[PDB]
């Protein structure tokens, strides 16, 4: 019965990732004064199925890889960590109700750079390794502001429990006392998922040696990460009303907010040019990190000066 | 070493409080108000004796005074209490704040039919004083005699006789 | 808003902790009889 | 050269984490709090040379609280003799050591 | 290096050693050693050449290994005692591991193999810090744990350090390796008297620090890192040859000089404890140290080696180097034996 | 002191906001009247069991029951 | 004593003998050094959690932080060694024999 | 226990999908060292240790020693800021700023 | 078998240490130390150290071993390794066989062979994690520890910027 609950988590993750590709192509179509895929399925709905079948029977690229083992382990690690980021998410009840779910998500997202690093080293191309090292340095840079922003917010929560964060936001959204943290959080999650304007893996100024199958596996891990970080941002700053006798009200409400936030990722990639690499390094280390440290001091000192320290339990 | 002395299985028989934790949490504030004295006698005995074997009879009084607490709810206010602990029992964290109107009906029926006032915020966490007839344990740690200390320094400090006495130095 | 609601949550936490406190003597007596029961059963089976 | 600056200036830089019987957050006791308190109050002030021989009982009780070697050796002996008597058929476990008695509270 | 950054880093070296000296908790001992190593790595890489990077890498590896062994000894002590007080250890395995770790930090033989390499790789001022200030924290830890130090281990380390430091300096022409093997032999003398009387350990430590600081200050004042460049000193600064003569005769322990003071007192404490063979063989082994000290005095003060023509230019310029405390250190390293009973201030 | 602040606000408003928010984090808890109530609420939270006292005979400030008048009260926390 | 302590100590001694027997790379030595640190972390943590010794719960974090700072320093030394010879081979670090 | 089952299920699904993707199309016949990247990785490591010091703050605010707690919390975030300011002014954050 | 779960994780922990300490390549050594860090976290989690285990994941694996693998990927791009690996594996499983057939062993210390569940406490901690409260007391009781750690981290920043500059 618990295995049914695990499957009803992780198989709808894969289906929502499959249809996020359709939603992205359609929204980037209609924001670019055109239509997206509308030929393959009715309203284009069979485009992800056809594209998955196309990628599964495409010829293998046959790399002469430096390590076979890490070449296999990088998609396995990427998909495993992409699926385990969902298990403490309270919507309204989590699959795994753990006391330190926030810190669990921060740790399991910090582990996801090894897929980039192992895929970059397992390729023969030195330039693939250079792009992998740039992507890892980008990701570990924005993990710093992830950790500190999330700590500053959880100073209003009282604990690392993700389910308590619904109780924290019963009177007001947490984007009202923490909108600068919310906007630096949102741009930092945008730079975590290698998402535009931070997609330097698609700019000419790391997983190119994989076949179409394992490229699709990295791609679906990336879109699982995108939907997950939008759900986590929704739980974190836009916490919905929860009736314990009707949990589906919370599920509908957080689902609508998470969909709008994923569509906001799609809006952002259809609106801005890319950063140069030193420019998003400048954005982290010289813009987001001083403000994030200042706001961390402010959110330490503010519950003490207002007598608004949240409960531990 | 010595043989540990355990009480028998007959000395541990008592009529148990066979109710769930939501029942206990729903009845908790009136239980801390009404069953104060044998509970505090037991916990005073339990922190002073530092031994459960020395605290059995007082503990039985706890298990005697809780049951008389619940029977007096079962005789008078069984249905508002049942409706209240069921609503407590639904919740995963068993919240008091989800159940305020069933609490109000239970407190109304208890204050009317039994005259019990629910304790205010801060009262059940007070340190109270307990009048006991048992003696204070003079050695609850069962400690033996401490070793005698070394003799202290006393007396006036005179200069060293003929100095340092280091081989040929006269001072 | 977070000031008012965190102060209310602290009062609710104190109410939960005092429900725990009012239940602790019964739980302590039950725990004592529980562990003495188990030690006596282990002692009798050690003897046999 | 243990320059005792902490006692000289009256500051507590690191005495608080030094022993388990010190003041803990929320008055949480260590599992060997009574044994460590007995061994410290025995050995206090008499020097280490006298504390080796004169506080051996409290220190052996405290080391056996910390590592439970005599306790685990006794449980080893009881469980091994029990397994030998089960293999010989000269013993049967009771219903309360098999899971058929519906525990106390 | 920025002078402010140099001051902060030297204060951090000092702070790490001071934290070791003042703390009652084993974690703060370990933190003091970590802080000291972290701060002293830039002092060794001050001049940015591959010999300094090699010396800093070798120093990092030996001190990090010793730090992990120290933390394992602390953790075993916590197993068998449930506490963290810096006092005697409550397990002989933890005592052995901590004695090994402190011997590695001191560079006592047979863990001595980094001391001539790291001392040769680094400048004279940083080797002055390495041979004098960096002994202070592990000797203070050895001071406090001596009720649990195994006698055979510490005396094996002591005699092995004295013999290996004696034979090691005989083959050397580089001054920094001479000071390093001299350091190894003097630390052997300090640990040999430790379980008998640690006041004589402190006396030997202080007299060693004074004499070693004197010799490094003379080497810095004359810009000499080899025997053969030190042999030019008579034609440039003839007072410096007299100072290196009296300081090297003092480091050999020849009376009436001050470096006769430790070993004599050490023998004075080892024969009270009925050890006669051991200070005898220790004193005879120290004649090796005196032999290569005498080699340096022959090349520098007691003969005149040939100089070069360009030395005549250096006759026209005075020493602008701050020779900090060099007359005071030279006097204390030579003329202190009539004040030998002052050692009781170390009790 | 006034042209410098306008100059750095025109050039580097991120750093001006950073130092302003950090300065308000430092100095304002010493100026807040509600900093005392944070300490009072933290010490009014009963994590442990209130172990009762043996009534020796003369303790007029220690109650015999939770609903007695004497003892520490939390009316300030209910009211605020 | 308890059975897990045998394996955590054996892990420490295995990483100790790995760190005391170099093959070629300085990076492998640094990995054995941080394995020694990891085993010290685990052993300290199991003791402190078993004892319910509350204030020492912050001790392994400190043990982590310092040692990772130590590891950072080691990596920097390796990089400077690797900025001299092209590799991090320990046999290139032999200039100080004379 | 449920967590170990969930981790095993996610790992099994990922390994199964990777095994499909590497063996379903088999049916058909058909660098110089950069000091700058190392410095940003080490700066990440040092600030990540400083973050590890900052992580018990939601629990540390529950103390009765709030003046000391607030002083030490502001001092740790201040030393992280002083680390950033030293990294800034000594040109450590340059060409990847 | 499930009563021995901390012991089984500790066996996998020693196997991972024999894996990387035999030193095949620093990248496979990094992988072995990553797997070891994960299973050692699992050991810590099974003694109830949730925060300390998540610090192994966040800081040791997600922070420090990331920088190790990063520097290794920037620097890098047998028979001794395999024999050393099977040697350490056979030594470890001889330890397992002895302490399981005897329920006692003595390598340097005496070790019980029962399941390590036996040593645990039989009570509760109420409404807190004791390990969380002891880590939270770093800010209330650990003032000097905060000072020396933060000063060492600031000095560590300064030291890395000194020695990596070359000037
Ligand atoms: C207690 C332990 C003390 C240990 C020594 C502490 C000081 C030395 C260490 C730091 C250092 O180098 O400081 C500079 C150092 C001079 O060292 P230097 O550069 O090698 O000396 C060369 C010339 O002296 C420099 O000449 P100049 O032309 O540049 O200037 C002349 C200078 C000008 O002087 C001043 O400017 C001083 C006035 C300002 C002082 C500060 C005011 C604020 O005169 C002197 O300094 C005369 C020499 C003073 C004696 C130096 C040694 C001190 C005694 C050490 C202990 C001896 C114990 C023997 C025991 C034997 C038995 C065991 O000291 C001073 O400048 C002031 C000395 C004051 C001594 C006070 C003693 C009692 C203290 C209580
Ligand atoms: C009413 C208020 C006013 C009252 C005022 C009263 C005084 C008025 C006169 C003012 C002057 C008073 C002077 C102090 C009293 C006499 C101290 C004395 O001679 O002790 C005898 C002392 C023991 O003989 P005693 O017959 O048993 O006792 C007679 C008194 O009762 C001795 O009395 P004690 O039993 O109390 O003596 C205590 C103890 C007695 O001694 C002992 O318990 C035995 C241990 C003594 C130390 C042995 C060290 C052995 C290894 C090192 C050898 C050094 C190398 C030789 C020198 C090389 C050249 C510099 O002495 C010590 O522990 C101090 C250590 C030795 C220093 C003596 C004082 C020197 C001050 C001037 C220094 C100038 C440079 C001198 C040469 C440097 C070396 C000292 O003699 C020796 O050990 C032989 C050496 C001679 C010492 C130096 C002579 C002082 C006068 C020198 C002036 C000419 C300098 C030439 C230029 C510089 C040199 C190139
Ligand atoms: C979570 C839900 C959603 C949240 C909001 C997100 C939706 C909006 C997204 C818009 C599209 C973004 C696409 C990517 C853009 C990336 C670039 C970018 O944004 O760069 C950030 C830019 C970077 O600046 P820059 O690079 O553009 O400017 C030049 C900077 N210098 C001078 C250094 C050269 O700004 C910031 O970093 C600011 C971050 C937020 C600051 C919030 C401050 C709050 C107010 C504080 C107080 C101020 C008053 C003074 C003191 C008063 C005291 C009482
Ligand atoms: C630079 C120093 C900055 C921190 C200064 C002290 C801040 C503080 O609140 O300290 C009080 C705290 C705690 O004081 P306290 O008042 O909380 O202590 C009461 C006792 N307990 C902890 C049980 C509640 O620290 C101390 O008083 C002693 C430790 C630090 C002493 C100063 C060391 C400075 C070293 C500089 C080199
Ligand atoms: C190259 C190798 C393969 C790589 C791909 C696959 C691995 C990577 C992806 C999986 C990562 C596994 C992470 C496992 C531990 C995660 C931390 C954790 O368990 O946190 C959750 C929770 C803490 O919260 P709390 O509520 O306090 O606990 C319950 C108390 N009421 O704690 C709990 O709920 C505790 C539950 C019991 C203990 C669980 C222990 C799990 C097994 C150990 C780790 C196994 C994996 C080791 C290697 C991973 C890779 C490094
Ligand atoms: C006391 C409170 C606590 C303070 C410590 C905590 C701070 C929290 C925020 C973290 C900041 C960490 C990093 C700070 C780095 C400062 C150094 C710096 O940035 O100098 C360079 C900069 C010029 O920038 P440049 O080098 O050209 O960079 C490229 C972009 N042009 O130079 C500048 O732009 C000048 C920057 C300094 C002057 C800023 C003044 C702001 C004043 C705000 C109001 C007063 C606030 C009260 C506190 C006093 C502040 C002085
Ligand atoms: C129970 C005991 C407790 C502890 C007691 C006290 C122990 C003291 C230990 C002394 C160790 C001193 C180490 C040296 C000082 C530290 C900083 C340093 O090295 O500064 C020297 C400085 C560097 O100059 P720099 O520019 O780097 O040189 C390159 C060429 N231009 O400038 C120079 O190089 C200038 C040249 C002269 C420097 C001489 C310094 C002498 C200092 C030691 C004095 C003697 C020891 C103290 C007295 C006895 C104490 C035991
Ligand atoms: C006595 C103490 C050690 C006991 C265990 C010995 C394990 C087996 C290794 C024996 C030595 C084999 C060997 O070749 O050692 C040298 C090797 C490094 O030398 P390398 O350059 O790689 O090879 C050329 C040959 N010298 O050295 C290595 O690579 C050794 C790596 C050791 C890692 C320890 C693994 C666990 C060992 C068992 C538990 C202890
Ligand atoms: C078996 C379950 C699905 C496995 C994954 C395959 C389908 C999802 C990824 C396919 C994909 C789609 C639809 C897609 O639209 C796309 O272009 C943006 C890709 O390339 C970058 C893709 O890889």
SS3 call for A82: helix
Q: Which residues of D touch B (CB under 8 A)?
A: 34, 37-38, 41-43, 45-47, 50, 54-55, 57, 104-105
C-alpha pair distances (Å), B8 with each of C38, D58, D101, E110, G46: 11, 30, 18, 64, 36
- The CATH number of G1-86 is which of 1.10.287.3510, 3.40.50.720, 3.40.50.620, 3.60.9.10? 1.10.287.3510
Q: Where are the domains of chain A?
A: 1-313
Task: Decide: helix, strand or coil at residue A238.
Answer: coil
> Contact, I9 vs I42, CB < 8 A?
yes
- Residue in G67, G15, G14, G60 with CA at minimum distance from that of residue G41: G60
Can you state the angle between helices B100-113 and B78-90, rounded to 10 degrees? 160
Question: Which of C17, C20, C35 lies closest to I122 in CB terms?
Answer: C35
What is the rounded CA–CA span in Å between residue B96 and residue E146? 61
- Buried b / exposed e along A44-69 (16+ C-beta atoms within 10 A): beebbeebeeebeebebeebebbbee
Distance CA A269, CA A196 (A): 5
Angle between the A68-84 and H2-23 helix axes, to the nearest 10 degrees? 130
Can chain E be said to touch chain C, i.e. do they have 3 or more Cβ pairs within 8 angstroms?
A: no
With 0-12 CB in 10 A as exposed, 13-18 as middle and 19+ as buried, what is I165? Answer: middle
| Best CA proximity match to E143, nearest among E16, E20, E227 | E20
Nearest to E8 by CA among H82, G76, F26: H82
Give one DSSP letter per residue of E117-138, joined into a string.
HHHHHS-HHHHHHHHHGGGHHH
Cα I148 to Cα I126: distance, rounded to the nearest angstrom: 33
Alpha helices for E23-87 (secondary structure H): 26-44, 50-81
What resolution in Å is listed for this PDB structure? 2.5
CB–CB of G44 and E78 under 8 A? yes
CB A166: neighbour CB atoms within 10 A? 21
Six-digit token string for E140: 């203070």
* CA-atom Rg of chain A in angstroms: 20
Burial of B55 (0-12, 13-18, 19+ CB in 10 A): buried
Instruction: List CB contacts (< 8 A) between C16 and chain A.
Output: 313
Q: Is E284 helix (H, G, I), strand (E, B) or coil?
A: helix
User: Is I57 within 8 Å of G63 (Cβ atoms)?
Assistant: no
Nearest-angstrom CA–CA distance, A273 and E220: 60
Instruction: With CA atoms as reference, report the closest residue to A286 among F21, H96, H47, H35.
Output: H96
DSSP string, H15-63: HHHHHHHHHSTTSS------HHHHHHHHHHHHHHHHHHHHTTHHHHTT-
For a pocket test of ligand 1, which of E243, E258, E325 has the largest count of ligand atoms closer than 8 A to its C-beta? E325
How far apart CA A49 and CA A70 sit, in angstroms, is 29
- Which residue do the tokens 């984090």 mark? F25
The phi and psi torsions of A32 (rounded to 5 degrees) equal -110, 25
CA gap A150, A296 in Å, rounded? 9
Q: How far apart are CA A176 and CA A264, in angstroms?
A: 19
Of G63, G81, G70, the C-alpha closest to G26 is: G81
Where chain I is discontinuous (C–N > 2.5 Å), the residues before each break are 77
> Residue B131 and residue F66: Cβ atoms within 8 Å?
no
Interatomic CA distance for residues I34 and I31, integer angstroms: 5
Whether residue C12 contacts residue B39, with contact meaning beta carbons closer than 8 Å, is answered with no
CA of E328 to the centre of ligand 1 (A): 9
G19: closest CA among I20, E77, E29, E20?
Answer: I20
* Composition of chain I by helix, strand, coil, percent to 5: 70, 5, 25
C-beta neighbour count of B1 within 10 angstroms = 5
Min Cα separation B17/chain D (Å): 7
Q: What is the DSSP string of A181-233?
A: HHHHHHHHHHHHTT-TTS-TTS-----TTS-HHHHHHHHHHHHHHHHHHHHHH
Strand partners, E226: E174
Residue ranges of the domains in chain E?
1-347
| Residue of I158, I160, I165, I167 best to disrupt the E interface, most CBs of E under 10 A | I158
Dihedrals φ, ψ of D85, to 5°?
A: -75, -25
Q: At what angle do helices I5-21 and G26-51 cross, to 10 degrees?
A: 160
User: Of E18, E316, E291, whose CA–CA distance to E166 is shortest?
Assistant: E291
- In chain G, count H helices and then E strands: 3, 0
Phi, psi of G81 (to 5 degrees): -65, -40
Distance, in Å, from the CA atom of I37 to the CA atom of I14, rounded to the nearest integer, reads 11
Backbone angles phi, psi at I39, to 5 degrees: -75, -30
D92 C-beta neighbours (distance < 10 Å), count: 10
Contacts 24+ apart (CB under 8 A), G83-86: G83/H33, G83/H35, G83/I166, G84/E50, G84/E53
Q: Which residue has the tokens 């992800």?
A: A48
Helix (H) / strand (E) containing I112: strand I110-112
* Number of C-beta neighbours around residue C7 at 10 A: 19
DSSP state string for F14-56: HHHHHHHHHHHHHHHHHH-TTHHHHHHHHHT---S--PPEE--
Tally of structural domains, chain I: 1
Note down the domain range covering I99: 4-164
Residues 6+ apart with CB under 8 A from B64: B14, B15, B38
d(CA B29, CA A246): 29
DSSP string for residues in chain B: -PPP----SSTT--------HHHHHHSHHHHHHHTHHHHHHHHHHHHHH--GGGGHHHHHHHHHHHHHHHHHHHTT-HHHHHHHHHHHHHSSS--STT-HHHHHHHHHHHHHHT-PPPPPTTTTTS--EE--SSPPPS-TT---PPPPPPP---S--PPPTTTT--TT---
Please tell me the distance in Å from G69's CA to the nearest CA on chain I: 7
Give me the torsion for CA of C10, C11, C15, C16, rounded to 10°.
Answer: -20
Q: What single string gives the DSSP state of each residue in E143-175? A: HHTTTTS-HHHHHHHHHHHHHHHHHHHHT--BH
**Pocket mutation for ligand 2, best pick of E258, E264, E338 (most atoms within 8 Å of C-beta):** E338
Q: How far apart are CA A289 and CA A299, in angstroms?
A: 15
The whole-angstrom separation of Cα E316 and Cα E322 is 18
The CA-CA-CA angle for residues F74, F75, F80, to 5°, reads: 105
Q: Could you tell me if E37 and E60 are in contact, meaning their C-beta atoms sit under 8 angstroms apart?
A: yes
Identify the bridge partners of residue A243 per DSSP, sorted by sequence position.
Answer: A246
- Nearest residue CA, atom 9 of ligand 4? H68
Give the torsion through C-alpha atoms of E251, E252, E255, E259, to 10 deg: 30
Phi first, then psi, for residue E245 (nearest 5°) are: -65, -55
Closest chain I residue to the Cα of D24, Cα to Cα: I134
DSSP helix/strand/coil, A306: coil
Peptide bond into E307 cis (omega under 30): no
Q: Cα–Cα distances in Å, from E225 out to A149, B106, E173?
A: 55, 93, 9
Q: Are I118 and I6 in contact (CB under 8 A)?
A: no
SS3 content of chain C, % helix, strand, coil (to 5): 95, 0, 5
Quote the Cα angle for A23-A29-A30, to 5°.
95
Q: Is F15 in the pocket of ligand 6 (CB under 6 A)?
A: yes
Query: Closest approach of chain G CAs to the CA of H38, in angstroms?
Result: 8
Check if the beta carbon of residue D62 is closer than 8 Å to that of residue E82.
yes
Interface test with D, best of G52, G57, G61 (most D CBs within 10 A): G52
Substitution site in D12, D13, D16, D26 for ligand 4 pocket (most atoms within 8 Å of beta carbon): D12
For the record, the structure tokens of G24 come out as: 């070629």
d(CA E33, CA E62): 13
Q: What distance lies between CA D101 and its chain's CA centroid?
A: 32
From residue B139, alpha-carbon distances to D55, E231, H18 in Å are 18, 79, 68
Contact yes or no for E92/E149 (Cβ under 8 A): no
**Do residues E53 and G81 touch, judged by C-beta distance below 8 A?**
yes
Ligand 5 neighbourhood includes I39 CB (under 6 angstroms): yes
Return the DSSP state at A240: P
Rounded distance, CA E271 to CA E259, Å?
19
CB of I147 within 6 A of ligand 4: the answer is yes
CA distance B95 to chain F (A): 17
Per-position b or e across D5-31, b if 16+ CB within 10 A of its CB:
ebeeeeeebbbbbbbbbbebbbebbbb
Give the whole-angstrom CA distance, residue B102 versus residue B26.
Answer: 10
Alpha carbons within 13 A on the beta-carbon side of E127: 31
**Closest Cα partner for B34 from B109, B103, B116?**
B116
When computed from its CA atoms, the radius of gyration of chain G, rounded to whole angstroms, is 17
Residue A282 vs residues A63, A294, H92, I22: alpha-carbon distances, Å: 36, 17, 12, 41
Map tokens 């902490």 to a residue.
Answer: D6
φ and ψ at E61, to 5 degrees? -65, -45
If phi over 0 gives left and psi between -120 and 50 gives alpha, with beta otherwise, what is residue A177? alpha
For an interface test with G, give the residue of H42, H43, H69 to mutate (most G CBs within 10 A).
Answer: H42
* D96 vs C30, C41, C46: nearest CB: C41
State how far the Cα of E118 lies from the Cα of A175, in Å rounded to an integer: 57
CA distance F46 to chain D (A): 10
Maximum distance among all alpha carbons in chain D?
A: 70
Q: Would you tell me how many other CB atoms lie within 10 Å of the CB of residue B156?
A: 4
Spatial neighbors of I96 by CB under 8 A, at least 6 apart, are: I11
Chains near B with 3+ CB pairs less than 8 A apart are A, C, D, E, F
Q: What experiment produced this structure? A: cryo-EM
The structural domain count of chain H equals 1
Strands B129-130, F53-54: pairing kind:
parallel
Of G27, G42, G33, the C-alpha closest to G14 is G33
Count Cβ neighbours within 10 Å for each residue of G80-95 and write b for 16 or more, e otherwise. bbbbeeebbebebbee
Q: Count of CB atoms within 10 A of residue H89's CB? A: 9
D27 contacts: CB under 8 Å, gap ≥ 6: F48
Cβ partners under 8 Å of residue F19, min gap 6: A294
CA–CA dist E59, A71 (Å, integer): 37
As a whole number of angstroms, the distance between CA G61 and CA B149 comes to 40
* Pairwise CA distance, residues I74 & G27, whole Å: 12
């Amino acid at each position: 019965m618990f295995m049914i609950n695990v499957l009803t988590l992780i198989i709808p993750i894969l289906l929502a990732v499959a249809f996020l590709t359709l939603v992205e192509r359609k929204v980037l179509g209609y924001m670019q004064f055109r239509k997206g895929p509308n030929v393959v399925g009715p309203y284009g709905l069979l485009q992800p199925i056809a594209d998955a079948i196309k990628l599964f029977i495409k010829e293998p690229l046959r790399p002469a890889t430096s390590s076979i083992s890490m070449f296999i382990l990088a998609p396995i690690l990427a998909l495993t960590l992409a699926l385990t980021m969902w298990i403490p998410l309270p919507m309204p009840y989590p699959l795994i109700n753990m006391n330190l779910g926030v810190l669990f998500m921060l740790a399991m997202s910090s582990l996801a750079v090894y897929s980039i690093l192992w895929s970059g080293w397992a390729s023969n191309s030195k330039y693939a390794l250079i792009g992998a090292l740039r992507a890892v340095a980008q990701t570990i840079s924005y993990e710093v502001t992830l950790a500190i922003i999330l700590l500053s917010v959880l100073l209003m929560n009282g604990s690392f429990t993700l389910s308590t964060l619904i109780i924290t936001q019963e009177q007001v959204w947490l984007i009202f006392p923490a909108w600068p943290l919310a906007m630096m959080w949102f741009i930092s999650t945008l730079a975590e998922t290698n998402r535009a304007p931070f997609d330097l893996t698609e700019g000419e100024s790391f997983n190119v040696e994989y076949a179409a199958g394992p490229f699709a596996l990295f791609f679906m891990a990336e879109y699982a990460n995108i939907i997950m970080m939008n759900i986590f941002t929704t739980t974190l700053f836009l916490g919905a009303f929860h009736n314990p006798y009707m949990p589906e009200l919370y599920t509908i409400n957080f689902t609508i907010k998470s969909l709008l936030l994923s569509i906001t990722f799609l809006w952002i990639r259809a609106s801005y040019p890319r950063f140069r690499y030193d420019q998003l390094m400048h954005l982290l280390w010289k813009n987001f990190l001083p403000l994030t440290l200042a706001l961390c001091m402010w959110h330490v000192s503010l519950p003490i000066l207002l007598s608004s320290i949240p409960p531990q339990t | 070493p010595g043989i540990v002395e355990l009480p028998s299985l007959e000395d541990l028989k008592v009529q148990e409080v066979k109710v769930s934790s939501s029942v206990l949490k729903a009845a908790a504030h009136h239980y801390g108000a009404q069953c104060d004295k044998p509970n505090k006698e037991f916990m005073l005995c339990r922190w002073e004796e530092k031994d459960p074997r020395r605290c059995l009879e007082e503990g039985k009084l706890v298990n005697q005074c809780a049951l008389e607490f619940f029977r007096q709810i079962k005789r008078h206010c069984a249905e508002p209490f049942t409706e209240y602990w069921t609503c407590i029992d639904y919740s995963g964290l068993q919240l008091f704040r989800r159940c305020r109107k069933e609490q109000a009906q239970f407190d109304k029926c208890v204050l009317d039919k039994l005259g019990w006032v629910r304790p205010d915020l801060g009262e059940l966490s007070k340190v109270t004083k307990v009048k006991t007839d048992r003696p204070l344990p003079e050695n609850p740690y069962h400690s033996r005699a401490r070793p005698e200390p070394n003799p202290e320094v006393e007396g006036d400090l005179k200069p060293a006789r003929h100095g340092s006495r280091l081989f040929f130095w006269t001072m | 808003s977070m000031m008012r609601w965190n102060r209310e949550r602290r009062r609710l936490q104190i109410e939960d902790f005092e429900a725990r406190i009012a239940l602790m003597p019964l739980l302590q007596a039950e725990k004592d009889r529980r562990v003495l029961q188990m030690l006596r059963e282990n002692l009798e089976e050690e003897a046999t | 050269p243990f320059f005792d600056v902490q006692k000289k200036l009256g500051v507590d830089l690191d005495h608080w984490m030094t022993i388990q019987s010190a003041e803990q957050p929320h008055r949480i006791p260590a599992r060997c709090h009574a044994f460590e308190k007995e061994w410290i109050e025995c050995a206090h002030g008499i020097g280490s040379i006298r504390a080796e021989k004169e506080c051996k009982i409290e220190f052996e009780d405290f080391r056996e609280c910390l590592l439970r070697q005599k306790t685990m050796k006794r449980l080893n002996a009881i469980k091994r003799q029990r397994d030998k008597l089960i293999k010989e058929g000269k013993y049967t476990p009771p219903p309360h050591h098999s899971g058929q008695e519906d525990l106390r509270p | 290096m920025n002078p402010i950054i140099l001051i902060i880093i030297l204060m951090t070296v000092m702070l790490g050693t001071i934290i070791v000296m003042i703390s009652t908790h084993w974690l703060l001992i370990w933190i003091g050693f970590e802080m000291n190593m972290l701060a002293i790595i830039p002092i060794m890489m001050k001049k940015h050449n591959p010999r300094a990077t090699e010396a800093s890498t070798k120093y990092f590896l030996t001190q990090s290994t010793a730090s992990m062994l120290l933390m394992m000894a602390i953790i075993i002590n916590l197993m068998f005692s449930g506490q963290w007080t810096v006092m005697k250890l409550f397990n002989p395995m933890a005592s052995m591991l901590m004695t090994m770790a402190l011997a590695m930090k001191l560079g006592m033989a047979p863990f001595h193999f980094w001391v001539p390499e790291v001392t040769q790789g680094i400048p004279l001022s940083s080797g002055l810090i390495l041979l004098t200030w960096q002994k202070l924290a592990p000797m203070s830890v050895l001071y406090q744990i001596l009720p649990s130090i195994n006698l055979d281990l510490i005396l094996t380390l002591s005699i092995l350090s004295i013999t290996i430091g004696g034979w090691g300096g005989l083959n050397q022409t580089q001054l920094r390796k001479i000071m390093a093997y001299s350091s190894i032999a003097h630390m052997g003398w300090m640990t040999a008297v430790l379980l008998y009387n640690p006041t004589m350990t402190l006396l030997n430590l202080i007299i060693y620090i004074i004499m070693t600081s004197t010799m490094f200050t003379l080497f810095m004042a004359n810009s000499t890192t080899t025997t053969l460049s030190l042999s030019h000193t008579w034609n440039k600064a003839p007072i410096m040859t007299i100072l290196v003569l009296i300081t090297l005769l003092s480091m050999g322990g020849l009376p009436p000089l001050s470096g006769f003071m430790p070993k004599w007192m050490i023998i004075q404490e080892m024969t009270k404890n009925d050890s006669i063979i051991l200070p005898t063989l220790m004193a005879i082994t120290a004649l090796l140290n005196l032999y290569f000290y005498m080699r340096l005095t022959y090349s520098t003060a007691l003969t005149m080696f040939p100089s070069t023509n360009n030395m005549k230019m250096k006759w026209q310029f005075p020493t602008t180097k701050r020779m900090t405390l060099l007359p005071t250190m030279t006097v204390l390293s030579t003329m202190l034996l009539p004040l030998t009973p002052i050692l009781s201030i170390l009790e | 002191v006034a042209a410098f602040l306008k100059n750095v606000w025109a050039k580097e408003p991120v750093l001006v906001a950073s130092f302003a928010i950090a300065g308000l984090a430092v100095i304002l808890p010493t100026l807040s009247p509600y900093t005392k109530y944070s300490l009072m609420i933290n010490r009014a939270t009963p994590y442990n069991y209130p172990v009762p006292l043996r009534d020796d005979g003369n303790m007029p400030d220690v109650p015999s029951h939770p609903q007695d008048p004497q003892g520490p009260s939390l009316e300030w926390l209910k009211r605020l | 004593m308890s059975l897990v302590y045998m394996n955590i100590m054996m892990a420490f001694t295995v990483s100790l003998t790995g760190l005391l027997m170099y093959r070629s790379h300085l990076m492998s030595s640094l990995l054995c050094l941080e394995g020694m640190m990891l085993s010290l972390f685990i052993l300290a943590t199991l003791m402190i959690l078993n004892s319910h010794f509350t204030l020492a719960s912050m001790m392994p974090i400190i043990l982590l932080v310092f040692a990772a700072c130590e590891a950072a320093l080691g990596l920097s030394l390796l990089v400077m060694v690797s900025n001299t010879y092209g590799t991090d081979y320990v046999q290139n670090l032999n200039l100080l024999q004379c | 226990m449920n967590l170990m089952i969930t981790l095993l299920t996610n790992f099994t699904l990922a390994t199964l999908l990777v095994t499909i993707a590497f063996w379903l199309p088999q049916l058909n016949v058909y660098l110089p060292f950069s000091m700058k990247f190392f410095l940003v990785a080490i700066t990440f490591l040092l600030f990540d240790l400083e973050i590890a010091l900052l992580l018990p703050l939601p629990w540390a605010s529950q103390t009765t020693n709030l003046n000391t707690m607030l002083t030490m919390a502001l001092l740790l975030i201040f030393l992280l800021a002083v680390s950033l300011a030293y990294e800034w002014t000594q040109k450590g954050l340059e060409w990847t700023e | 078998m499930m009563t021995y779960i901390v012991f089984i994780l500790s066996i996998i922990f020693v196997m991972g240490f024999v894996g990387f300490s035999s030193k095949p390549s620093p990248i496979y050594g990094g992988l072995g130390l990553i797997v070891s860090g994960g299973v050692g976290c699992g050991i810590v989690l099974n003694f109830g150290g949730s925060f300390l285990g998540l610090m192994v994941f966040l800081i040791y694996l997600g922070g420090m071993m990331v920088v190790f693998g990063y520097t290794t990927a920037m620097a890098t791009e047998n028979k001794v390794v395999l024999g050393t690996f099977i040697t350490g594996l056979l030594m470890e499983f001889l330890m397992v066989y002895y302490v399981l057939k005897d329920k006692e062993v003595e390598i340097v210390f005496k070790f019980n062979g029962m399941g390590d569940w036996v040593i645990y406490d039989t009570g509760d901690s109420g409404f807190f994690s004791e390990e969380a409260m002891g880590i939270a007391a770093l800010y209330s009781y650990g003032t000097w520890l905060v000072i020396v750690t933060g000063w060492s981290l600031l000095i560590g920043v300064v030291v890395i910027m000194e020695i990596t500059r070359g000037n």
